[PDB]
Each structure stands twice: as C-alpha cells, then as structure tokens.
Paper text:
pmcMechanistic target of rapamycin (mTOR, also known as mammalian TOR) is an essential serine/threonine protein kinase that responds to nutrients, growth factors, and cellular energy to promote cell growth. mTOR nucleates two distinct complexes, mTORC1 and mTORC2, each characterized by specific subunits, targets, downstream signaling pathways, and functions. mTORC1 contains mTOR, regulatory-associated protein of mTOR (RAPTOR), and mammalian lethal with SEC13 protein 8 (mLST8). RAPTOR binds the LST2 TOS sequence to present LST2 to the kinase catalytic site in mTOR for phosphorylation of LST2 S670. mTORC1-dependent phosphorylation at S670 leads to monoubiquitination and stabilization of LST2.
Interestingly, density representing LST2 was observed only in the RAPTOR TOS-binding pocket, suggesting that mTORC1 recognizes LST2 solely through the TOS sequence. RAPTOR clearly bound LST2-WT whereas the binding of RAPTOR to LST2-F401A was reduced 9-fold. Binding of the full-length protein to RAPTOR revealed that substitution of the first phenylalanine in the TOS motif with an alanine (F401A) is sufficient to reduce the RAPTOR–LST2 interaction approximately 9-fold. Thus, the consensus phenylalanine in the LST2 TOS motif is critical for binding to RAPTOR, as also demonstrated previously for 4E-BP1 (19).
Numbering used by the authors:
A (entry chain G): 399 to 407
B (entry chain E): 18 to 219, 236 to 686, 806 to 840, 950 to 1116, 1125 to 1292, 1303 to 1331
C-alpha cells in the first residue's frame, strides 16, 4: 500500500 | 374540517415496487482498479560530488553552500566525506523504500556506471529502477545531451551520453537529476526517445524523470540552504520544509524559533503521536490533497497511487517546487504536472507547522506535554460542513484524501468512518469518487480490527461499495472479510438495520461466485441465515432469503447443508409473509434451491416435489412480481425434470401435471409481463436449450435500494416540497368540492333535465364510473375503456383493457380517489387490473398491478379507509383482497346457489351486503367467525337484484331492486323490509346516490325515472338504458342508452 495503516489489531 | 380524513388514508398500490419498473440497475464501468503494481526493486545512486575541487564552470563564493545530504564534506576529508554522504543518501532513500537493492557509485567512470546499470537491469528486468544523479561536482550538461563523469585518474571530466545511459537502462525506470541545467538533461532524454521512436519504424511514457532545474536556470547558491536541495526536498521533505519555514518572514509572528531549536526537535518520522511524526503525517496528507485536487484522475492514479516510492517522490516534489520557486528555480518532471505552488492547502500547511512548532520551546525547556494538532479535526469538520449541503453533484470535497489519511490512525478513526459512510450515502457517484481516491485497500484492511465499535460503520461502507461495484467480492473473500461479516450477522444485539446491511453484503459476495459461496458455506452462513429468518424486520428477512437463494445457486453442497438444516421447511413460512418483497425473495430462494438437484437420491426427488407443491399453492397471489418469481421457479423445475414435463405435455395432446396446470394458469395472467414469461416457458417445453432459461431482475432491483441514500429525510416528510404542496392543494380542492356538494344538497333537489352533452361511443357503454373530484368519467366498453369530461366535452383516452372477446368489464372503481387516482377494472372472468395515468396529457396509459381474482359477471367493492378490496361473482364465494399485503385475507362462503349480482359495504363497520340472482339480499359481518359471518337472509324477490347498494349513513338502508322493479328498503337490524315500492314492471339498470336519496332507474321504452327513497315522483325523462352512475358528491347522473350515447345530467 502507498500509506501505512497502523493500530489495526 | 375534512382535511384530516384525506391525510390518514393509505394509498393503495403506491410504493416502490409499483412505481419503479422491476429491473436491475446497469453496472457502471468501474475503472478505480489499479492496472498494475510496479516496484522499485533496485536503486542506483550516482554521486559526482567531486569533494575538495570546485568545477571550473561555476566560481563558488567564499561562504558558498557546503551542505550535501546534511553533511559538511570539508570537515572530514574527501574520501570519508564522500562515503558518508553516499551512506546518508542511502539511508534517506531507505526511509521511503526500505526494501530495495541500493548500489552507490561514488565519482564513477563511464564503464562503472555501465556495469552498475546493466547489473541492476538484469536483476530487475520488468520492475522500476531508480537512477539518482548528482552533478554538483561536474560541469553542466551540454545541449548535445551528455552528462559528465570522472576518469580513472580524476584529471578530466569525461562525458556520458544520455543515449547510452538509457540504452544501458530499461523501459521501466525513474530518473532523479540533481544538476544545474537538469532541464537540458530532460530535453535531451525526450529527444533521444523521439529518435528511438523514429528509428523503430524503419520508452518515453514508461520512463519518469525528476529534474532540479529548467535548462536555463541555475541552482541556488545561498549559504543557508543545503547545496543538495532537490534531493533534500525529495527524500527529507519535513526537515527542509521546517528550515525553509524558519527562513521566511512568517517567523516574525512566532518569536523564539530558530534553526537551532529545529535541529533539536523531538520525535521521529514514524510515531505519529510525536511532534515530528505528526508533522510528517500532516505533510503527507496536504501533499496528497494538493495532488488529488490539481492533477487529473488518470495522472494522479499513475503517479501518486502506483507504487510507494514514486508516490512519495512526487508528493515531496510538490514541496520541492514550492520551495525552489522562491529562489528562481523551477523543478521539471517528465509528466508535466500543473503548478501547485499557489494551492490553498499550502497555507494550511504553514498554519499547521506554525501551531506545531509554537510549542517547541516549551517542550524543549519546560518539558511540557505535546498537544496534538487540530489540523485533522478541523479538516474533518470542513468535510462534515460540505456534506451538510453536499447533496448536489457539485465540485468534489477537497478533504477526501484527508479522510483517507485520518483513517490510518485510531485517534479519529470512528469520526472518519462515520463521515465516509455519510459521503457514500450520497449516491453511486460518491462511492466511485471514494474508490478512485483509493480507500478500498485500507477499508479492506480495517476488517482485521476486532474493535466492536467499527462494525456498523464498516458494514455501511462495505454495503455501499458492493452496491455500486460487485467486483469486490473476490477481494473480500481473499482477505477473509466474510468471516467479519458473518460475525457481525451473528450478533442479536446488533441493530436490525446493520444486520440487513450485512445480509446484503453477504448476498452480493456470494452472487454467482463459486469461491465465495464455498467460503460462506464453510462459514455456516446457512445456519446464520436460518436463525435470523423470522426476525421482525421486512428488509432483513427479504435479504436473508435472497442470500440463502444465492448460496445454493448451482451448488450441491449448499443444498445438502440446507436439507440437513431443513432450510426449505423453515423458508416455507416466508411464503405467507404479508410483505410482498419477502414473499418474492422466498420464492426466488426456493426456485434456486430446486434448480440444482443434479440427479440425487430419491430423497432429493421427494424434497423437490414437496417444494413444488408448496409453491403450486401460490398461484392465487395479488403481486405480479411474486408470480413472476414463481414462474422462474417453475422454469427451474422444468429444467430439472425436462423429460417428465415433456411426457406430461405429450400425454394430453400426477405431480408434474399440477405444475403444468399452474403454469397454464400463469400463462393466461392479467399482467402482460407474467403472461409473456409463462408463455415463453411453456414454449420452451413444447419443443422438447439452455438459452430458454431466464433470470428476473428482482434481486438486482432490491440491491438497488442500498445505492440510493437512506440517511436523508424522505421527500414526503418535507413540508415545503413541491409534492406535498400539490397534495395539499388537491386536498383543499376536495374539501371545497365536498362543501359545495353539501351546500347544494342542503338547498333541496329540483327537477334535473339539463343535458350537458350528447355524444357517440364506439361500443356499448357497460359500466360508468365518475371520478369523485376531477371532471372525468370512465366509461368501459366491451373491448375498450373511454374517459370523457363533462366540462370540456372531449374524449380524453381510449384504452384496450386487454381481456378476450368472451369476457366483459363488469365492475369498475377509482382507487385513491383523493389524489393520484388509479382505476381498478375487473372483468367477468376474474381478472382484476389497475390502470394509472389514464387522463394525463404527457403520460401514456400504464398498468400498475393485476391479479386473477376468484376462479351477474363479477362485482367489486373498494374500501379506501381500511385498504381492503372485496370481489364476488358467479362463484358462491366472497373473496376479501387486501391491497396492502396483496393477498386474500378472508374467504366468507356465500351459502347460496345464485350468483352475487351486487356488492357493497358500510364504512367503519363490517356490513358486507350482497344482492343475489335468486333475490335474497345477504349481509355479512367479517368480525366474527366464517361459519357465523352470515347475519341476516331475507328473501322477498324472485329476480336478479340489479343493485343492492348500501347507504354510508349510520342508519344504513339497503336499497335493493330486482328486475321486477320493486324497491324494498332493508335494515341490518330488522329481518323485514321497511318500505316496499313498485316502479317499473321491466327494469334493466339503476344506480343510487348515497348523499342524496335519489334512485335512478331505467326502462325499455326510453323512460328514465329518478325517484326518491319515499317513492315520490320527481322526474320521468323521455329520450335500453344499461348504465347509470351518480357522482359520489355532486347530484350528477350519467345515462347511457343501448345506442352508444353518453349524457350527464345536473340540477340547474
């Protein structure tokens, strides 16, 4: 992915 | 006043299923999908810095600019400085693309660069390779298209042709130039690409270039900024951005901020909770917003959404352009990006940086707590403000990428998801825009979160996305999001609306998708649906039934699972559901369950027969859509048992015979579409291939519901809407009409001999019905239905009711007379059909619904207040049809051999009366049991009862008249007649007026007596009169003789 999604479980 | 009465009247046959045509919405060409995913497997860093020696071309100033990659070369020796600069640049690039083969080249020779580029291309033949060049230590590129590098002895700069440079490289590659005349390099690259294209006849779009300056322009030499400026912007945007901000006059607004404090800024680029991470996040969001708002959709997807490294490079290139514009420096890129230095988002960036770094002195000295920036909260507030009045398809909001960015973190995740769901609720265009921005992968990743508060928002968003675009089923199954949806649907505590939302999502996931069907079957979705099948919610039951139908569509394992769970037996209950939509869904599910027998054991045959018989009792259904779904189910049955149906058909030229009879009944259906489908199905059996199978659009029509907005208030509730204003005007007109009629009646009744108009009709006027308020009368003929007016005196419409020759239109009624009136036309054979737009200028005749009733002619009596419809005829049965549920509610036996010649009821009471051919006038009260429904039965006539009408007054007086012409007024509380009158020896037709007790009779000798309830002679009009009708409010009477003439009479 282009960005970094955090705090996903 | 009388207004309250009109408002609280249900509008029969006025709903989505009746107005909108039952069909699936055409799927738009969804291009939000990414075509390919490139990766920068390797990166080439060519650094021709020439530390310790100044190029002859440019005479550097005494202070000059000595900062390259945030390193001062002169303080640590030439070779050591060069090596550390290379390592630092590699670290900076790894900050964005940690996984890539970085091969630094420090002051290389043409052969060294050749070998490096060839090796990198061989390693990654079809993946992007970044080529970084620094021409700070070498002379400027020449117009001929050459780049200067060093020889072995470092005594002379040897050129390197761009032609050979790209010959060594490959088509997939991106070039970053940091030179003085980098625009010259870009121009030479483009010219060489054009030369290659010309030569090929007898790699221009694939290659991407980032240049520090235009051909003419020179790099800045200001001592404060780094010498390596373009690469600093591209790779370390935040540090250079903060330095540049600290170099501007805006610092005057914030005293006590200096570059020294910037050097000691706490936090890192990753932890978004720290000031530096928050600043990096804000910068990323602002650059993404600028790119999305400014660049076109295709270029934005190609550059800022293809791969991480290129997207980051261009996002930082926006900042590079903004920074270097102030120094008479114009960066150049291979795809010409429209300028972004004046975009309004840079002001927001400056404000955010100011607010963030205004607290820096306190953090450094006092060690206070860092308060998070309100930038994201303010942007989401702006997005909410836009949504407040964003119903119109105006310019898209500029905060969509901001919402995308804030979705990443958890601080404002709930509000971001709520706002995104609200935006998607706007319509399919909103969801297309959202998916184009690139929310799909991140929303998909959200399903991995176990936070119980995200389930409603996530299911709303995913239901919208699946409604607009059904190709997301593969992605959802791949990521195992169907497990998340099943967990959502398995929670009784969840609100019903979100549960049906998830049911729709699951139905779309398994819609003609074997992988998804298997995944859901292994998820016990059959049991989950069954447990939630009897829930008190129409839409939830409908969509659970649809999901069950789609699960076992051409899937034997799902059918076996349902049989083990007794799915068909439990689903049988929905066949009696009052809501027609749930009945249609259940019929579709049962048909799909039947259609995949695939020649299993005798138990399969028995279950198939049981389902066939349970569906075969659904022929007598009021909803044409449910009958069409039934016809599809029997078509599936036929396909499963083609040979048996063929044998049964050839037999007549006992299970399958019953289904054949049902299909024949559906073939002669009043609704043209159902009849056509049934006839096509039967013809598919006569010539006995796969092409004969037809699938209705009911499922897609239901799926269309989630595409339309749900959150916003319905238009009906809108007080100032045009539709409600028109309805209010119509109700005011109706109230005025009633008041005028009452005033006229209060003045008494005078002789009525005025002939408003005399005309000629193509056929025999059989039944004439007056529209209560608007000046229109519907006259039905043997093969047509005319609509005439007594004010303009012009023929408005001429229908063909559609019934065959032997049949005839017997009864007629005006549904929803107060407003949006329909016309119910019931033929002698039982076919009841409803017409719309029958007296409109710009609208053609339309059929709303129709359904074979029953099965003297046939008599119909509509009751608007309670919404019931009662039919009777030659049969000994008085059926009670409910238009709300579209099912026969009660079946009261007539208990007489003779046919029901007339039928009427008293409002607000159950006093169904019925004139009989023998002469008896029977009264029925439906409140009590069917066996005791009969109340009174008095026989004082021996003839066909022309009209046993009833007065709407509380003291109802059944004015029953037979062919003998003797009037006998009866009461429901007296078994004997109260008034006995004799009028005409031979009577043909008559009508009665409830408000004014005027009984209009006919005669064979052209006489037309309009007498009173007391029998007093009033008029004897001199001209077979086979149709009389009284306007329900006015004292208007229509007379149609055997000759095809129509006249209406009034009192002065």
């Amino acid at each position: 992915r282009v960005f970094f999604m955090d705090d996903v479980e | 006043e009388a207004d309250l009465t009109d408002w609280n009247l249900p509008l029969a046959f006025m709903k989505k299923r009746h107005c909108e045509k039952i069909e699936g919405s055409k799927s738009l060409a969804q291009s939000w999908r990414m075509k390919d995913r490139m990766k920068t497997v390797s990166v080439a860093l060519v650094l021709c810095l020439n530390v310790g020696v100044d190029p002859p071309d440019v005479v550097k100033t005494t202070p000059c600019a000595r900062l390259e990659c945030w390193i001062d070369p002169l303080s640590m020796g030439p070779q050591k400085a060069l090596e550390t600069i290379g390592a630092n640049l590699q670290k900076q690039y790894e900050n964005w693309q940690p996984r890539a083969r970085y091969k630094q080249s420090l002051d290389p020779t043409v052969d060294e660069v050749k070998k490096l580029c060839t090796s990198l291309r061989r390693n990654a033949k079809e993946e992007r390779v970044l080529f970084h060049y620094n021409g700070h230590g070498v002379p400027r590129p020449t117009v001929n298209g050459e780049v200067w590098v060093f020889n072995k002895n470092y005594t002379q700069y040897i050129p390197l042709s761009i032609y050979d440079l790209q010959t060594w490289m490959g088509s997939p590659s991106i070039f970053v130039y940091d030179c003085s005349n980098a625009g010259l390099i870009v121009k030479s690259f483009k010219q060489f690409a054009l030369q290659r294209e010309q030569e090929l006849e007898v790699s221009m779009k694939n290659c991407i270039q980032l240049a520090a300056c235009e051909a003419t322009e020179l790099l800045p030499m200001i001592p404060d900024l780094p010498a390596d400026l373009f690469t600093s912007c591209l790779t370390t945007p935040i540090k250079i951005a903060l330095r540049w901000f600290c170099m501007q006059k805006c610092v005057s607004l914030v005293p006590g901020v200096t570059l020294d404090l910037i050097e000691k800024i706490p936090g890192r680029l990753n932890d978004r909770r720290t000031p530096l991470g928050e600043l990096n996040w804000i910068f990323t969001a602002i650059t993404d917003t600028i790119a999305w708002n400014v660049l076109p959709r295709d270029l934005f997807q190609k550059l800022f959404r293809q791969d991480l490294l290129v997207a980051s490079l261009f996002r930082n290139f926006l900042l590079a352009e903004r920074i270097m514009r102030s120094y008479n420096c114009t960066p150049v890129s291979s795809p010409r990006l429209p300028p972004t230095y004046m975009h309004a988002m840079w002001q927001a960036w400056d404000l955010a940086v100011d607010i963030c770094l205004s607290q820096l002195p306190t953090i450094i000295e006092e060690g206070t707590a860092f308060r998070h920036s309100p930038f994201f909260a303010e942007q989401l507030t702006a997005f909410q403000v836009w949504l407040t009045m964003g119903v119109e398809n105006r310019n898209p909001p500029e905060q969509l990428p901001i919402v995308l960015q804030v979705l990443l973190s958890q601080v404002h995740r709930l509000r971001a998801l709520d706002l995104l769901g609200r935006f998607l609720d706007l319509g399919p265009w909103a969801v297309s825009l959202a998916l184009s921005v690139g929310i799909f992968p991140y929303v998909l990743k959200l399903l991995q979160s176990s936070a119980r508060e995200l389930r409603p928002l996530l299911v709303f968003i995913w239901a919208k996305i699946l409604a607009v675009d059904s190709s997301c089923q593969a992605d959802l199954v791949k990521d195992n999001g169907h497990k998340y949806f099943l967990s959502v649907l398995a929670d009784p505590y969840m609100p019903a609306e979100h549960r049906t939302m998830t049911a729709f999502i699951l139905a779309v996931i398994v819609n003609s998708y074997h992988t998804g069907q298997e995944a859901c079957l292994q998820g016990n979705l059959i049991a989950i649906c069954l447990e939630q099948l009897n829930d008190p919610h129409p839409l939830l039951r409908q969509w659970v039934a649809i999901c069950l139908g789609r699960i076992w569509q051409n899937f034997d394992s799902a059918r076996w699972c349902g049989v083990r769970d007794s799915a068909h037996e439990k689903l049988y209950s929905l066949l009696s559901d009052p809501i027609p939509e749930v009945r249609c869904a259940a019929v579709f599910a049962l048909g799909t369950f039947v259609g995949n027998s695939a020649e299993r054991t005798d138990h399969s045959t028995t279950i198939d027969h049981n389902v066939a018989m349970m569906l075969a009792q659904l022929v007598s259904d009021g909803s044409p859509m449910v009958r069409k779904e039934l016809v599809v189910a029997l078509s599936h049955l036929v396909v499963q048992y083609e040979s048996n149906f063929c044998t049964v058909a050839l037999q007549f030229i006992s299970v399958y015979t019953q289904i054949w009879r049902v299909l024949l009944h559906l073939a002669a259906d009043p609704y043209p579409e159902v009849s056509d489908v049934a006839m096509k199905v039967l013809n598919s059996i006569a010539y006995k291939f796969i092409s004969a199978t037809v699938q209705t659009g009911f499922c897609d029509w239901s799926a269309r519901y989630f595409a339309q907005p749900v959150m916003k208030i319905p238009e009906e509730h809108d007080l100032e809407s045009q539709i409600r204003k028109e309805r209010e005007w119509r109700f005011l007109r109706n109230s005025r009409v009633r008041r005028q009629a009452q005033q006229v009646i209060q003045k008494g009744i005078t002789r009525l001999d005025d002939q408003i108009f005399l005309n000629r009709n193509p056929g025999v006027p059989s039944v004439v019905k007056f529209h209560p308020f608007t000046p229109c009368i519907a006259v039905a003929d043997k093969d047509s239905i005319c609509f005439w007016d007594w004010e303009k005196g012009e023929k408005l419409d001429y229908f063909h009711n559609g019934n065959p020759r032997y049949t005839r239109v017997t009864a007629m009624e005006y549904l929803n007379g107060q407003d949006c009136s329909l016309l119910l036309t019931a033929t002698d054979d039982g076919a009841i059909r409803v017409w719309k737009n029958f007296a409109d200028l710009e609208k053609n005749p339309e059929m709303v619904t129709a359904w074979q009733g029953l099965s003297a002619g046939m008599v119909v009596d509509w009751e608007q207040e309670t919404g019931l419809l009662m039919s009777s005829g030659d049969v000994r049965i008085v059926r009670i049809w409910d238009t709300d549920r579209e099912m026969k509610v009660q079946d009261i036996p007539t208990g007489a051999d003779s046919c029901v010649t007339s039928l009427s009821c008293d409002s607000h009471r159950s006093l169904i009366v019925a004139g009989l051919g023998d002469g008896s006038i029977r009264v029925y009260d439906r409140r009590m049991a069917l066996s005791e429904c009969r109340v009174m039965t008095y026989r004082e006539h021996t003839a066909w009862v022309v009209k046993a009408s009833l007065q709407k007054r509380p003291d109802g007086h059944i004015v029953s008249v037979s062919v003998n012409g003797d009037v006998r007024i009866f009461d429901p509380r007296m078994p004997e007649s109260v008034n006995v009158l004799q009028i005409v020896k031979g009577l043909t037709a008559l009508d009665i007026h409830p408000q004014a007790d005027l009984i209009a009779c006919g005669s064979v000798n052209q006489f037309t007596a309009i007498y009173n309830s007391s029998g007093e002679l009033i008029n004897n009009i001199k001209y077979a009169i086979s149709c009389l009708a009284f306007h329900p409010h006015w004292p208007h009477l229509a007379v149609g003789s055997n000759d095809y003439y129509i006249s209406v009479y009034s009192v002065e």
